[PDB]
Amino acid sequence: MTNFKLITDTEWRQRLSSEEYRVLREAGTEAPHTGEYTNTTTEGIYSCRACGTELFRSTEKFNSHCGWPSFFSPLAGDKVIERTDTSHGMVRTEVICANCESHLGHVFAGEGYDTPTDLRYCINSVCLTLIPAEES
Ligand SMILES: [Zn+2]
C-alpha cells in the first residue's frame, strides 16, 4: 500500500500487463481482448491489475458481461478518484485509481439509471482483475 508514484518504469513493466503500463501511465486506451487470463465468470470485487485495489464491487454493478459495461457508485470512492477535465466548453469526469493513475476509464452523470448517484462508469475494458467473492 506504498506510494506507487515512486515506482520505476521497469517495475511497472514487470508489475502489470503491457497494455496496463501505457494505459495506466497516460490513458493510452482501454481496448479489451488483450489477455487470455482475464476471467469474469465469478461476480465479486473488481481489482486494479496495477495494484489490486477494490475499485468496484458487485453491490453497485449492473451487468452480466460486456466489453464496456456501466456501473454505479464504487466500494467507497477510497480505491478510485473521480475528477473532471475542462478540455473544452464541456468537461468530462475521468475515473482514476486512488492508488494509481487509472485514467483509462471515465464516468458520466445524469444518465437516468434511477440511482442515487446516477453515474455511468465505463471501466473494466483493459484486462482488469476480478476477485471471486464467493458465488457459492
Ligand atoms: Zn490501481
How many distinct structural domains can be found in the chain?
A: 1
Determination technique for this entry: NMR
Catalytic residue set: 122
Q: Quick check: is 57 in a domain? A: yes
Q: Could you tell me the residue range of the domain that residue 30 belongs to?
A: 9-131
The residues whose Cβ lies within 5 A of ligand 1, an ion, are 48, 50-51, 53, 97, 99-100
Ligand 1 center–CA 116 separation, angstroms: 25
Considering only CA atoms, which of 103, 126, 121 is closest in space to residue 32?
A: 126
Gaps (C–N > 2.5 Å) in the chain: which residues precede them? Answer: none
Q: Quick check: is 54 in a domain? A: yes
Ligand 1 center–CA 29 separation, angstroms: 15
In CATH, what number is assigned to the domain containing residue 100? 2.170.150.20
Contacts of residue 109, Cβ cutoff 8 Å, sequence gap at least 6 = 93, 117, 118, 119, 120
Residue with cell 491489475: 49
Ligand 1 center–CA 53 separation, angstroms: 6
